[PDB]
Amino acid sequence: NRRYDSEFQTMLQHLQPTAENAYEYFTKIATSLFESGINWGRVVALLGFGYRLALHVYQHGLTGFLGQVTRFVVDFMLHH
Amino acid sequence: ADPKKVLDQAKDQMENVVRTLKQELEELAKEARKLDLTQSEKIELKLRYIVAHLAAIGDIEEAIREAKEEADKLKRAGLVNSQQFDEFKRRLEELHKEADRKRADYAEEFRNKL
């Protein structure tokens, strides 16, 4: 059951969320969605969005730290 | 022929969902053509788009679930055999792949407009 990952990804790249505003953006999305109606598929889709929004925000920070760590180690092997 | 009727229920229901998504994305694109649109109002249009795209996903996932349960009733009664039942889920998956393509194409062209 993976049919929606390409769409979930394109949505997150359109939104361009950060670690600070991801939860605010998510709660606004969740509220407008459930105020217009709640059903099994919408709860699954929202939780699916929620989890991938968390991975989107935090993989952004992960690749950054990995870049800093790797660039540092090779820098020390370069000058020293 | 009875599973063919259940498939027609899912096809029409998924297409109304995709049309509901189409009509609201047109309404959001009209408001994105507003003069002197703030960066905040552009963000509020992005959030409203995600709400509509999620609703289109979950409501198609709702029509698929009901169609599978309507067929589970037919199988337990005995009106469909294993070959006819497995053909149902095969053609139900193609209608699902088709609704996904149309849903994604509407969201994709909207993102390009905004």
Numbering used by the authors:
A (entry chain A): 86 to 165
B (entry chain B): 2 to 115
Sentences from the paper on this structure:
BCL-2 protein family members BAK and BAX are the gatekeepers of mitochondrial apoptosis. Homooligomers of BAK and BAX form pores in the mitochondrial outer membrane (MOM) and release apoptotic factors into the cytosol, committing the cell to destruction. We use computational protein design to generate high affinity binders of BAK and BAX with greater than 100-fold specificity for their target. Both binders activate their targets when at low concentration, driving pore formation, but inhibit membrane permeabilization when in excess.
We solved a structure of the BAK:αBAK2 complex in the P1 space group, diffracting to 2.9 Å, with four BAK:αBAK2 heterodimers in the asymmetric unit. The four heterodimeric complexes in the asymmetric unit are similar (between 0.15- and 0.29-Å Cα root mean square deviation (RMSD), 193 to 195 atoms aligned from a total of 197). BAK is in an unlatched conformation with α6 to α8 helices dissociated from the BAK monomer core. The unlatched α6 and α7 helices form a tetrameric BAK crystal contact in the structures, with their hydrophobic faces packing against α4 and α5 helices from a neighboring BAK monomer. No electron density is seen for the BAK α1 and α2 helices. The SDS–polyacrylamide gel electrophoresis (SDS-PAGE) of the crystals shows that the BAK construct is truncated, but only in the crystals and not in solution. The design model of BAK:αBAK2 is very close to the crystal structure, with an all-atom RMSD of 3.2 Å and Cα RMSD of 2.6 Å after alignment of BAK α3 to α5 helices (residues 90 to 141) and αBAK2. The position of BAK helix α3 relative to helices α4 and α5 is shifted by approximately one helical turn in the crystal structure compared to the design model, which was based on NMR structure 2M5B. Despite the α3 shift, the αBAK2 h1-h4 BH3-mimetic residues occupy similar positions at the BAK interface relative to BAK α4 and α5 helices. In conclusion, αBAK2 binds as designed in the BAK BH3-binding groove and can bind to BAK in a partially unfolded, unlatched conformation.
